[PDB]
Amino acid sequence: GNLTVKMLGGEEFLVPLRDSMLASELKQQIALKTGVPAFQQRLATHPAGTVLQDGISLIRQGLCPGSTVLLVVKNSNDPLSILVRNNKGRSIAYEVWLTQTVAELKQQVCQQEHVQADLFWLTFEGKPMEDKHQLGEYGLTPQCTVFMNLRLR
């Protein structure tokens, strides 16, 4: 069983379909296969154009082998100001957009705190941030505070 993913302009590609596959997990497969990050993907069915529900099975939403899904890419790229607090209670302001990665953000903090990017990791609202992910996946709001945590090694 294969799902056909179609982009604006006509480009299409196949994604293997599992019954109990969640729509969120479809986005991760498209992300893996195309490099379009999941949080930038908007998915809908064909030919109705009804949006997919991220927490429901694809088979439960009328998709079966041969079905088509429409992909539209949404890009935030809206710069905002956030703070990153180091382990001494000092906060520096950084400008980012929600489509930047955690890795890009660590590069900025790296240059301001003079700590190698491998000796620390970042957290927002207690959840650790992974280098390859994009900042929008953690829901950063203007003037929120990301925390810098030091590794022993």
Binding site: G9, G10, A44, G49, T50, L70, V72
Partner: protein
């Protein structure tokens, strides 16, 4: 600079036929100034030469006049402006 596949040459032509149709409708409102009307006519003519070229490179049953491509372009524009596949489902085909 974004990496694109082989279908982009066709998609871009169709999109820009949609752009040209927007310019044309805007000019009827008496709101497109004189240099803008000039870019409209330049766009049309470069578009028409790319459609002649591209149609030669394609199978006979995939050739489309400017007018047909304009409708495809308009469908794509509607989907982009509302960011909603429902506004133009046929924009997703070559």
């Amino acid at each position: 600079q974004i990496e694109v596949g082989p279908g982009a040459t066709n998609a871009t032509i169709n999109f820009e036929a949609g752009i040209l149709e927007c310019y044309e409708r805007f000019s009827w409102q008496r709101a497109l100034d004189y240099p803008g009307q000039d870019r409209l006519h330049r766009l049309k003519r470069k578009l028409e030469s790319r459609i002649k070229t591209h149609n030669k490179s394609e199978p006979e049953n995939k050739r489309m006049s400017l007018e047909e491509r304009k409708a495809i372009g308009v469908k794509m524009m509607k989907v982009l402006l509302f960011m909603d596949p429902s506004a133009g489902i046929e924009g997703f085909e070559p």
